[PDB]
């Protein structure tokens, strides 16, 4: 790796080189930058309807919003810095920003502050056993919010209730609004208060002077579904600027290559993205942001030849870069 004369000796495996021309290695211009191009991030998804909502409901009358065919922006949700608890299992939300799933569900309810442990699979008690439960394979990420100045009212917010009892253990993701009566013994209730029959519905005592276990806490569950249908919702991505006349790396939506980008005199149809040659090689690509086609030309490469006389006479050599322009050698 010191002399082109000595590089010839490492290929011929000898200490004496006679007169002639020899090929030693190859020349290749290394890429400098990496161009990442992608289409726009339009057709945004209405995430403010469940996160920045004004209206809400109880723990048993929770609504359901369908999220599909949109872009899932989770960057502002992870760095929100305006919410109480953000804990979830296994999959961290900092790498979920560049993934794609099938369906996304988001709920809306307000629970007590001391009942925050009940929204978990395998938990028993008041809310998980009588109102609403989650299955064991829940891989989503929950999110809560304190609403001491939003949903609180003086005197008491008796417009919303929460169940204290139920007949048996409910199936996960159940939307039960009805008002069945709990029976304990062999005495039937017959829809009226009697022996061994307790009223499950208990009204809320939401007050601005309430404790930590009696304050309204807006908690939203968020679940992720992987189905055999093809994925429709995805995360966002960021592109860079466009560099011309340089052998760089290509990162398009469905193409990856290496070469330079110059102006093309061709005409493309609006029902096609890129073009190809007769030997299945790409030569022209369209920018997904602005409607302009760019030619794909590979940067220069070629073999290296060493012209030298015999070593018994002198030691001066000549280096010939075959097919390479010497504006690009230094």
């Amino acid at each position: 790796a010191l002399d082109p004369l000595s590089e010839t000796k490492c290929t011929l495996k000898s200490f004496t080189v006679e007169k002639g021309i020899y090929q030693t290695s190859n020349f290749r211009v290394q890429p400098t930058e990496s161009i990442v191009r992608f289409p726009n991030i339009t057709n945004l998804c209405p995430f403010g309807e469940v996160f920045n909502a004004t209206r809400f409901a109880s723990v048993y009358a929770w609504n359901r919003k369908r999220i599909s065919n949109c872009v899932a922006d989770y960057s502002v949700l992870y760095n929100s810095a305006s919410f109480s608890t953000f804990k979830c299992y296994g999959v961290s939300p900092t790498k979920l920003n560049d993934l794609c799933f099938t369906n996304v569900y988001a709920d809306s309810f307000v629970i007590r502050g001391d009942e925050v442990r009940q929204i978990a699979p395998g938990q028993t008690g008041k809310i998980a056993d009588y109102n609403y439960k989650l299955p064991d394979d829940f891989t989503g990420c929950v999110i809560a919010w304190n609403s001491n100045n939003l949903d609180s009212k003086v005197g008491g917010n008796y417009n919303y209730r929460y169940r204290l009892f139920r007949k048996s253990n409910l199936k996960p993701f159940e939307r039960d609004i009805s008002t069945e009566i709990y029976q304990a013994g062999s005495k039937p209730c017959n829809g009226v208060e009697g022996f061994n029959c307790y009223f499950p519905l208990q009204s809320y005592g939401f007050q601005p002077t309430n404790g930590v276990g009696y304050q309204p806490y807006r908690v939203v569950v968020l679940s992720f579904e992987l189905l055999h249908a093809p994925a429709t919702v995805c995360g966002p991505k960021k592109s860079t600027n466009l560099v011309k006349n340089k052998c760089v790396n290509f990162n398009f939506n469905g193409l990856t290559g290496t070469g330079v980008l110059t102006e093309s005199n061709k005409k493309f149809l609006p029902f096609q993205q890129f073009g190809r040659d007769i030997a299945d090689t790409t030569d022209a690509v369209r920018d997904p942001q602005t409607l302009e086609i760019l030619d794909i030309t590979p940067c220069s490469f070629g073999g290296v030849s060493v012209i030298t006389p015999g070593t018994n006479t002198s030691n001066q050599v000549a280096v010939l870069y075959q097919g390479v322009n010497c504006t690009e050698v230094p």
Binding site: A279, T281, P298, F301, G302, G303, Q322
Partner: peptide, 22 residues
């Protein structure tokens, strides 16, 4: 009388001008 993946074409030693002189 009528590339990309590491293919190159080397030019001959004698051009068409020097063949016509012979």
């Amino acid at each position: 009388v009528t590339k990309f993946n590491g293919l190159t074409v080397l030019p001959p030693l004698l051009t068409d001008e020097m063949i016509a002189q012979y």
